[PDB]
Design a binder for this molecule. Structure first.
Ligand SMILES: [Cl-]
Ligand SMILES: [Cl-]
Ligand SMILES: [Li+]
Ligand SMILES: [Li+]
Ligand SMILES: [Mn+2]
Ligand SMILES: [Mn+2]
Ligand SMILES: [Mn+2]
Ligand SMILES: [Mn+2]
Lengths: 243, 244, 244, 243
């Protein structure tokens, strides 16, 4: 026969309202929603996944994802299941000299999982930052190549770790973080800061991983960084998984 | 305290390759991710050496050469461990079921080689586009049945070589019906009917493929996914089996 | 000699928006490309001012506000001409044909406003996913007919406002059958049969939609494309009509 | 009734062998192949497009595309049609100090078009380069932000313009061009060169457009540049169309 680990729907696009520590915002999600299927059961009930999403008007947060995942495995009459919800996430930032405010966008995934009435949750957040090359600075009489970099942090904890917490962990460690709106003094600040704080992809993943190890709510994690090397047409890349 | 890095190197280097499999040799274009382990005490790896390796090597890619490449990499980069993953479109000559007219079909393949302390392991992933036809549709309708393209993706790790086409055949054997670039009128008639007579849920498809893979004694672990681009909704029906 | 630049500014700024149309207000996420004309004698534009504009403006997007935005942009950037293009998913509440159970469907929309010397013009593009069912398949087969999802994309420019949902209705009216997120057993029966009874080639679909658009006196030009993700091949059947 | 401008197949993936001035190479293409459909004709003949590609074993070049497009409109019995073929294109480069050789990849589209026995052709080439900001350099006491940039050149001519010619036009104008393989002295050269040759996106499109205007084989063109600004999470962008 063969049991199926997960069966359900993938990439249902759906508007959501999201509440986190700093505020509530409206965004647009892709959802994948699946349940365990026992060896002798032929199929699951595909329409119920969509039925569940249409019924809940509730704002999404850590508590609401748990409640959705519970109601899902109940509704589909299964022992286990997963909801993963992916979305762009906005945060208001303050330029470092002018203090002019502007949004930046991050890509987030939240997963909730039931196994035999036990719940687990995990999250993934992609944070774009500036990386600048220490080797380039050191060998060159002037200048240093630099590029946008995508730092992706996956983690699982028991206590809630906020999206913005993960963002701050990474942005703190970057050669320089990004802003949508920069005035001339802000551009000057950012250029010089990056140049004063060059980091290899190695340095970045180690620097971030140390911060996460220190956060005792975190049970496991992966930190990746991809740097879109401005002098090549391919990327430098690294990752650390823990434990 | 310093922290070893699981994998560091280059990602998404695009590179032309010639590939040799059981059915012949072909020229394709790959994307490569090439990384080694970095111990705590070492500040960085040697990034240009990954590209040097590809530029230097001229030989046709196959299971043996991927092994040699991965071993040569860890040595060149002065490391104890590493991975090469190579992703590319893969073509195979197909024949129409009625006419016998031939055309190519394209598949997406990734091959990974991995070294750990001198121990080599290898895995592979293949996405096979098939036709899926819904049994519930046919069953409840006085005529017709909704169908759609579906992507079946098989990831496996093995102790001995498993050929790309063997993975393709394990899947295509099980499809409601397989795809062809070029179909004449009678072929299209055959393909329409086959699919109608052989409706399979995503659940049925992942199960039929997993059975074949559990039975192959070379396969130490696998995942079979199938995604059905339901022709009646704007989302997919999805399932997967991981084994063991 | 210096060269004027047709359009210069920012591209793919991602930004949350609230959109007001005839059927109600909704919150979505857009990508913006915002550019102005640069005359020969000017070295560069003022890049931060494009983002300043978006941050400053708080009002709901609609046909009028897009006009105001584009005019405010060219003034802020001290230029004679420019474009704002805003791309986003767009949702609409649908109802199942038998049960009457409601669910959303998602559409991809771009709206463009353009200023030239104080003259405003606007265009729009909408991708509508539909079901397509092949007439040749049905016709030659003793049972069944291959079908698949297909993307119908309508680009138009108009002198007066044409609503997003109006474009959606011009297409969906013509489909072999339209899509629904949530379908019960009887709905699925209805949708299977409708599609079977109403087979249409990509050629038929582009033609039926173009007829509606030629007839609308607001539409000064258009393109209708349809792509059918043929469930029997691994490539698409494609057509388009440009008018006039 | 209504005539259809173009009807046929889209994104057929297909291996091709390509001959250009510097050599022959094997790559993988996407093809879109369409014909005009008269007002009272119901449908075209979809299988013949694929039949045509399978029959021709010939290496692709400017002459062969013309011949394919001719044979297509003949075979489908139509007055007009288009073949567009898209593919990654490799070129061998020489590092600027060490002279170590390595490939770089470019994205190319070639289009051939028949209208009532008259042929036309056009091409599109995306060239990735390094861009470095003159404003950043000028205001900062040290450093200058820089990023990978995608310069896309579309042109139509009567006489053949080679892919490599379009690449050279662009690479010559970039703050610095890209290489896959760079040794430490090469990295030093590239860092300093870019920094000595900062250009705005405005400067880049004007500099390239001037080069193309000077090429009298070229009838019309578009030059775009998108710079993946290393300090923002969005791109600077410009284009010039001519005439
Ligand atoms: Cl993510
Ligand atoms: Cl291109
Ligand atoms: Li921990
Ligand atoms: Li000219
Ligand atoms: Mn470097
Ligand atoms: Mn069904
Ligand atoms: Mn057909
Ligand atoms: Mn700048």
């Amino acid at each position: 026969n063969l049991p199926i680990n997960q069966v359900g729907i993938k990439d249902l696009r759906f508007p959501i309202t999201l509440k986190t520590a700093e505020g509530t915002q409206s965004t647009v999600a892709r959802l994948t929603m699946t349940v365990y299927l026992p060896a002798e059961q032929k199929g699951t009930h595909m329409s119920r996944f969509v039925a569940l999403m249409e019924q809940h008007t509730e704002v999404l947060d850590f508590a609401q994802l748990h409640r959705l995942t519970a109601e899902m495995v109940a509704l589909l009459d299964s022992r286990a299941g997963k909801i993963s919800v992916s979305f762009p996430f906005f945060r208001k930032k303050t330029a470092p000299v002018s203090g002019i405010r502007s949004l930046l966008d991050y890509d987030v995934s939240l997963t909730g999982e039931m196994k035999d009435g036990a719940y687990g949750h995990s999250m993934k957040v992609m944070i774009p930052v500036t990386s600048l090359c220490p080797c380039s600075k050191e060998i060159s009489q002037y200048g240093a190549h630099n590029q946008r970099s995508h730092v992706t942090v996956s983690l699982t904890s028991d206590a809630e770790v906020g999206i913005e917490e993960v963002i701050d962990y990474v942005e703190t460690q970057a050669s320089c973080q990004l802003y949508g709106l920069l005035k001339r003094p802000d551009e000057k600040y950012v250029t010089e800061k990056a140049y004063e704080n060059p980091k290899f992809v190695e340095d970045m993943v180690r620097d971030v991983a140390t911060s996460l190890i220190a956060d005792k709510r975190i049970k496991s994690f992966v930190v990746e960084s991809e740097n879109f090397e401005s002098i090549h047409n391919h990327s430098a890349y690294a990752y650390i998984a823990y434990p």
